Write a protein that holds these residues in place. Structure first.
Motif: not given
Ligand SMILES: Nc1ncnc2c1ncn2[C@@H]1O[C@H](COP(=O)(O)OP(=O)(O)OP(=O)(O)O)[C@@H](O)[C@H]1O
Ligand SMILES: Nc1ncnc2c1ncn2[C@@H]1O[C@H](COP(=O)(O)OP(=O)(O)OP(=O)(O)O)[C@@H](O)[C@H]1O
Ligand SMILES: Cc1cn([C@H]2C[C@H](O)[C@@H](COP(=O)(O)OP(=O)(O)OP(=O)(O)O)O2)c(=O)[nH]c1=O
Ligand SMILES: Cc1cn([C@H]2C[C@H](O)[C@@H](COP(=O)(O)OP(=O)(O)OP(=O)(O)O)O2)c(=O)[nH]c1=O
Ligand SMILES: Nc1nc2c(ncn2[C@@H]2O[C@H](COP(=O)(O)OP(=O)(O)O)[C@@H](O)[C@H]2O)c(=O)[nH]1
Ligand SMILES: Nc1nc2c(ncn2[C@@H]2O[C@H](COP(=O)(O)OP(=O)(O)O)[C@@H](O)[C@H]2O)c(=O)[nH]1
Ligand SMILES: [Mg+2]
Ligand SMILES: [Mg+2]
Lengths: 12, 683, 683, 12
Positions: B339, B671, B335, A7, A1-5, B288, B667, A9-12, B663-664, B658-660
């Protein structure tokens, strides 16, 4: 299931 | 069906709504009484057994000659003085099917567990009877488990090598590529897994001596290495497993990743080459900020600067490469590439994600070299130098190729015996012996790095088993506190033993003076931060054990400065998926995949409940797939800060994510300081 | 369409029932005037051209420095004094598309025919102006044609090797196999085709260090070699071509042949690796009597006898192997294997068939080694010694590996000028220079054998063209008589030039004293039989040329005995492919496949009638497929008796002829003394 | 075809 990044998501 | 398997099949037959976990002890008893004792050849005395095994090319006569027969006899007696009993059927089955010595027809069992342990201890001690008995007590208590090559092949004649893994640096030439293929086949013949760094290989469409657009890239080398590993596949005992590692800023990164696509054609698809991707912090920064990134042609960088692309700092040299018209490059979306990585890990589990800057920020031997790639299990993070193999009759410039001698601590057994210090020191001595006795004539760089670096790998296992058997959830902060304290003590005693070995032998590893151990930068966080447990429940586990304080770490730092360090690298946590059964331990520091593993060996299924799984600790043995991967990343980063090398960190994902989400997790691992990520297992 | 291509298409436009063959000369004129003269870089003088070519790294400076500019200018004037004109458009197209030097952007043309020939002659002469002019006269008369590597790369900096072939002996070890892969790649990057003898490799199911059923056979080595040749694809401009040869008594012979089956799976199939089968007379005897044959495991024989299977005379040791219980084998059907060979050649043209006893019955250097395998073109038959490549930092035992120093005589232009002696001697000198100047550093055995054996290959082409243009049918006995006389003359003058070079240099080839040249056994049939033409028509073709007699052969034998012989091997008839167009000649001594060749170039259809084709000699130019293969075998065997090496003998088969017909042709070739059979071309 | 060999194809 491709879900686009979407943003915030690079910050936590 | 065999009686032992049928009794083991009774585990899942629930009576009164509860699992019959007591049937596993019955299963192992039946297994022994009905198969193992009957199929074990017995000798009138140990002298007859040793003579028969030496004369029939089962044992080396060299390693047994340093001991008088009374010493060997007493070592065996103190091995049987323990009266070790396997706690589960799967432990005995795995040992007597994979490691126990059998006759040439594979029909009778020549080695008990206490004989394998005695032989390995006698090999480790090398003429010392007291040290041999110490090793026997260490292994029969199952506090320390030598790696599968070491445990299986120590003291044997029909053996490969005792080294579990090899890391080869492939230079950008046909001579170097052919020699890399040769060395890969030679080391796969020895039985060890081979990892190759393809980041120095120039990209596809590059120039070969004024002949432009002639290269096939790294993918042709992957095909060559894949067929080399298929050919040198240990005759079919276990398929030849090799690894290829490429920097994410290499131009062939997409072609490198496409080798694991299912839709990829057979002319570009590899099958026995595991792939790993090295991700500098610059790539994460570009992804990012969503800026368009550039993957570079390595040969253009080599021509412009005189150094290979992976030999330079990406974070510093990226803008210079991009602004250099002489450095050829192609534009990519970082990005979109992330993905693609996530979807590749979801569909196949590849590539091995290696965060180069997470490795080199705490790497003690950056002066020797940066860690440009990992091993086949993505846990051996060591400095390596590429070897410039020249033409025939021309002397080759031999570099350093990583050889990793692995060993695992059983955290449950180490903690229950309150013997962190003695176990760590004895394991360090055994790994030093394995490194010393190991020579490889067909790999000049592996041999040179084994002699000079003296790097060893002291891993750990049964972390989740120990936590669950102590009522600690693997994701709980108490578990992370215990991991912090335990691995800080392990690092302390490994460093202490390395310094003691350097003092006793008067020699340190090559280029030690430039390492952070000599300058004291390694001990800064140890002389500044106290790693004693913050929870009283965790602190009670270390009762009767001296937890190294800040003053003790200062004393160790002074001792290392005065006497040096014998090993460049000491700690690396391998998956240890095979020897975990024999030791009745969970694999690595990873959380358990299944509470009761279902395994089919033949026409019968053999259930393996987790070590110590019961009704009272059922929910403490939480399956890794049901756990929050962020908490597992937190645990591994807590462990990783006390491990100089990497950890085989496997990501356990659900099909819903998912792939998101992948990726999370990637990342968050980057981090939190995670050095390498091994696998993405989907349920 | 271009004007020259359009004029070429008028060849097939028939007027008055006859092909417009005169349109071809108009095609050459149009091609030159409209394309070549416009797109050739012209300089104010030869000095500027030479400076531009050396400075821009198009030519080597070392070979031009041996001559003053006056000598080079005189040589170029000699080349242009002939005013050579291509008689067919396809000749000029081939030269100015493949062999003419072009600028780095390929937009323009730097070399004419008279320029490439002058540069090749200047390279050959090595500082001698008169010798350079003699070579210029030899090549501009098109009497002698240096091989494609030699003609292409002579005196050019951007090149490969002038050597066409590389025949490698692969010993039965992983180190030797790895070195075979390395050397195969290092010689494929040089351009020349590589052939490997795999008969020494132990079969599938053999032992690797006393563990049984461990080897995967020679098929794994063929996989490695095929991927090595695919990787060394020479930019992809010409795909990496490699051959693998296996003795028919090798156990893996069935799996060796199974890789060329169309139905074979991708897990066994090899694509870029041509295969050849070496058939001793013993296999043919076993097939003849319809008795069960045995294929032996080579390593069992090596263990029992201390010698490799292919180093022992199978006609003598087959029974010893069969009645030896310590030699492993399986029963096979020799006639079934012959039928399998025939159907494999019908389906794919593979394998090359090498009759080992036919080669070794008249092999002069059997003392050095028996001929165990042939080259990629199945025409080089030389003694080879295996190299024992040992582990690193251990000295390797370097053997002998064969290399092609090829050159072709144009029989038509050789006999029109009545200069068989001069052409053969000058060609021998040029091939000697090519062999001497070849220094390959990454192939130790190849370099050692090039220095020691000093073997060259002097082939002939345009046999069918000469016969048809002189009113002689290829299958006619007069053609065989002419071939006998011509190739006896060629052998006589090649031996004479080799002995003269040995006298002038004071050295022979290594181990010459054991050869049949020194003992006089080679000259037995030459001092006992007269090879003068038996036909008045054929004898008139040699008028004006002194045909060597029995007494002349006796004098040559005495001269060789007193002075020695410089070349171990001198004559081998290569297929003579794309360079046959440039010389306006039929390919090799083979009959023409088609009277008018239909070739596709880009979006155009080009027609190439064979040279000298017209209405009067239309039926003399009989197509090869229409010929009786038995009479072609007779022709080649007549030629073969005067060639010390083999001949690239391609079988031209009709669609209606079954596998029994192919087997009959193969067995008649074996019976008539044919050494090798190259291809089975089915129409 | 796949015509098999006979005893008379081995003598000429
Ligand atoms: N659970 C087990 N683990 C390991 N070995 C076992 C196990 N059960 C049986 N065996 C093997 O089978 C033998 C016979 O088993 P058993 O327990 O009856 O022996 P034992 O020596 O009389 O026992 P005990 O330890 O109670 O004195 C043991 O000596 C041991 O070698
Ligand atoms: N049939 C051909 N074969 C080869 N080269 C040719 C041919 N026709 C022309 N050329 C080349 O093109 C050039 C000019 O062509 P053309 O036939 O007009 O020459 P030319 O000056 O009339 O001839 P020549 O120099 O013999 O008096 C020639 O010098 C030659 O290099
Ligand atoms: C290592 C290896 C060898 N082989 C085969 C190919 C070689 O021709 C052959 C010899 O290998 P060797 O390199 O000679 O192995 P060895 O010397 O240990 O074996 P021994 O002492 O019995 O000679 O083994 C394989 O097929 N697969 C392999 O992985
Ligand atoms: C010969 C060859 C090289 N290569 C690539 C792979 C190697 O990493 C790279 C280096 O080749 P090299 O062997 O180093 O080429 P070279 O030394 O003759 O010329 P140069 O040093 O200027 O390049 O070329 C191919 O991809 N295919 C081939 O067939
Ligand atoms: N007798 C015997 N002992 C073995 C064998 N393999 C391992 N051992 C162990 O090696 C030790 C040898 O002691 P042993 O010779 O039996 O002393 P003893 O009891 O006085 O005769 C024992 O403790 C055994 O447990 C074997 O094949 N035979
Ligand atoms: N001028 C010239 N001559 C060439 C070239 N290539 C080959 N040649 C030949 O080299 C020889 C030398 O010619 P050149 O230097 O012009 O002699 P010149 O007429 O006395 O000036 C001639 O026979 C030419 O046919 C070229 O590019 N330019
Ligand atoms: Mg190079
Ligand atoms: Mg060997």
């Amino acid at each position: 299931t491709v879900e686009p990044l979407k943003d915030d998501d690079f910050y936590f | 069906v065999p009686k032992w398997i049928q009794l083991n099949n009774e585990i899942m037959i629930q009576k009164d709504g509860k699992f019959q976990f007591d049937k596993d002890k019955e299963a192992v008893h039946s297994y022994f009484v009905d198969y193992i004792n009957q199929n074990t050849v017995f000798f009138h005395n140990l002298k007859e057994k040793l003579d028969y095994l030496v004369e029939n090319q089962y044992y080396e006569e060299e390693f047994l000659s340093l001991y008088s027969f009374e010493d060997i006899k007493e070592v065996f007696k103190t091995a049987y003085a323990k009266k070790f009993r396997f706690p589960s059927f799967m432990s005995a089955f795995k040992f007597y099917n994979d490691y126990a010595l059998k006759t040439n027809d594979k029909k009778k069992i020549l080695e008990r567990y206490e004989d394998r342990i005695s032989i390995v201890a006698l090999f480790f001690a090398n003429g010392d009877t007291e040290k041999a008995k110490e090793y026997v007590n260490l292994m029969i208590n199952q506090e320390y488990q030598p790696s599968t090559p070491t445990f299986l092949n120590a003291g044997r004649k029909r053996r490969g090598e005792l080294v579990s893994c090899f890391l080869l640096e492939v230079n950008d030439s046909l001579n170097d590529i052919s020699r890399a293929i040769d060395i890969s086949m030679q080391l796969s013949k020895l039985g060890g897994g081979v990892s190759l760094n393809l980041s120095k290989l120039r990209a596809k469409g590059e120039a070969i001596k004024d002949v432009e657009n002639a290269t096939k890239g790294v993918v042709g080398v992957m095909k060559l290495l894949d067929n080399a590993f298929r050919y040198a596949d240990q005759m079919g005992q276990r398929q030849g497993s090799g690894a290829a590692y490429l920097n994410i800023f290499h131009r062939d990164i997409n072609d490198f990743l496409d080798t694991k696509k299912i839709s990829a054609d057979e002319d570009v698809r590899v099958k026995t080459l595991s792939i790993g991707v090295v991700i500098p912090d610059k790539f994460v920064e570009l992804a990012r900020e969503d800026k368009a990134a550039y993957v570079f042609y390595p040969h253009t960088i080599y021509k412009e600067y005189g150094q290979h692309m992976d030999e330079m700092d990406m974070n510093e040299m990226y803008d210079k490469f991009v602004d250099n018209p002489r450095v050829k490059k192609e534009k990519i979306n970082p990005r979109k590439l992330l993905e693609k990585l996530a979807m590749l890990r979801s569909e196949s589990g590849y590539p091995y994600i290696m965060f180069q800057d997470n490795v080199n920020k705490v790497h003690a031997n950056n002066h020797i070299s940066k860690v440009k790639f990992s091993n086949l299990c993505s846990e051996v993070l060591q400095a390596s130098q590429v070897s410039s193999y020249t033409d025939y009759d021309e002397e080759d410039e031999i570099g350093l190729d990583i050889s990793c001698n692995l060993g695992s601590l059983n955290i449950l057994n180490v903690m229950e015996h309150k013997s962190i210090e003695k176990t760590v020191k004895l394991a360090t001595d055994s790994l030093t012996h394995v490194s010393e006795t190991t020579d490889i004539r067909n790999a000049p760089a592996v041999r040179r790095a084994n002699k000079a670096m003296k790097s060893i790998g002291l891993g750990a296992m049964n972390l989740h088993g120990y936590l669950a058997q102590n009522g600690i959830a693997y994701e709980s902060p108490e578990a992370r506190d215990f991991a912090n304290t335990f691995f800080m003590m392990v690092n302390f005693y490994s460093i202490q033993r390395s310094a003691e070995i350097a003092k006793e032998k008067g020699e340190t590893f090559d280029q030690y003076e430039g390492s952070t151990y000599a300058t004291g930068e390694y001990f800064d966080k140890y002389v500044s931060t106290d790693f004693s447990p913050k929870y009283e429940k965790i602190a009670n586990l270390f009762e009767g054990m001296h937890i190294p304080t800040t003053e003790d770490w200062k004393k160790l730092k002074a001792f290392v400065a005065e006497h040096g360090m014998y090993h460049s690298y000491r700690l690396c946590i391998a998956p240890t998926g095979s020897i975990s059964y024999v030791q009745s331990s969970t694999a690595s520091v990873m959380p358990i995949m299944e509470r009761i593993e279902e395994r089919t060996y033949g026409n019968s299924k053999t259930y393996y409940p987790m070590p110590g799984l019961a009704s009272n600790n059922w929910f403490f043995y939480k399956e890794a797939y049901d756990m929050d991967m962020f908490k597992v990343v937190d645990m591994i980063a807590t462990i990783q800060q006390h491990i100089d090398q990497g950890i085989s960190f496997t990501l356990f994902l659900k099909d819903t994510m998912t792939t998101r989400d992948l990726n999370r997790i990637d990342l968050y691992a980057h981090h939190r300081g995670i050095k390498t990520i091994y696998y993405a297992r989907t349920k």
